């Protein structure tokens, strides 16, 4: 069972209470009693009628509890595999400290330094062929 709210006064409407208007467009309006109903019919503006939720909001009457309510939290956790990387490859990789990196590194870094100058002499090779390669 639902408590509707008065669409002029913001008042709680319990089952059976008040009335429900259905306008031409089809905007539904609900009033809690015949006072809000009437003020609505007179084309009053809730924002200028002081007892309403709407006026009270537009005039910062009340609040105070909301300017007090601040903070609260809680968060987080850990790690999942990646397919082609079990948590173990991930432990193994992550763990190993710089001196093995530099090691690994400067090895390969020397290892293909060889490949480079090797392919280079390979160029001059198919070229002292191609500045020869006769009849």
């Amino acid at each position: 069972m639902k408590v509707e709210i008065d669409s002029f006064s913001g008042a709680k409407i319990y089952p059976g209470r008040g009335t429900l208007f259905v306008r031409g467009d089809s905007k539904i309006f609900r009033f809690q009693n015949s006072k809000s109903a009437s003020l609505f019919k007179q084309r009053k503006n809730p924002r200028r009628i002081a007892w309403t939720v709407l006026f009270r909001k537009h005039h910062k009457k009340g609040i105070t509890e909301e300017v007090a309510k601040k903070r609260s939290r809680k968060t987080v956790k850990a790690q999942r595999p990646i397919t082609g990387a079990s948590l173990d490859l991930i432990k193994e990789r992550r763990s190993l400290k710089p001196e093995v990196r530099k090691a690994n590194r400067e090895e390969k870094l020397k290892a293909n330094k060889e490949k480079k100058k090797a392919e280079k002499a390979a160029r001059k090779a198919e070229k002292a062929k191609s500045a020869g390669t006769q009849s």
């Binding site: 968060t75 956790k77 999942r80 595999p81 590194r105």
Partner: protein, 177 residues
Amino acid sequence: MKLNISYPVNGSQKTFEIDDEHRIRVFFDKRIGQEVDGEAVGDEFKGYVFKISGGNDKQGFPMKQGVLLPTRIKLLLTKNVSCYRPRRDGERKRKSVRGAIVGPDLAVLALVIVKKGEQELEGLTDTTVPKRLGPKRANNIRKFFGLSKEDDVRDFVIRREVTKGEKTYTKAPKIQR
């Protein structure tokens, strides 16, 4: 309704089915992003915390963060937004969309786990799922490994093995910047 639960630490996900108005009802008037303590919804999820993220009503309309409302409304939508992918430059469409406030009119709630509960959920905590693609731009490789503008990438790029049958190969990105 059906719950769509994601464990975004592992990259896992599974669905769950709740019948029982009282077990559900914990989610009512809760909005997108609100947290929900687990035990209320079940004994399995005891302790578990859920941050609500969206989901669909019957008739399938997606929720849209920020509307408020526990109903459906039709909005003009634009480039760069939820529940709309524009067909043409500067096209906008007026489309039905569901409010961001949970009601029993939903076929599916979409939750993301924020804190793990006291017990394991099988397809979610037990299983763990590899991040499809690795860093491609230079300095993102530098960051995903912590490196210094000294270390040289090339041998830090990822290397994905895939087989021709009796010829197993090795493909890496193509570093940029």
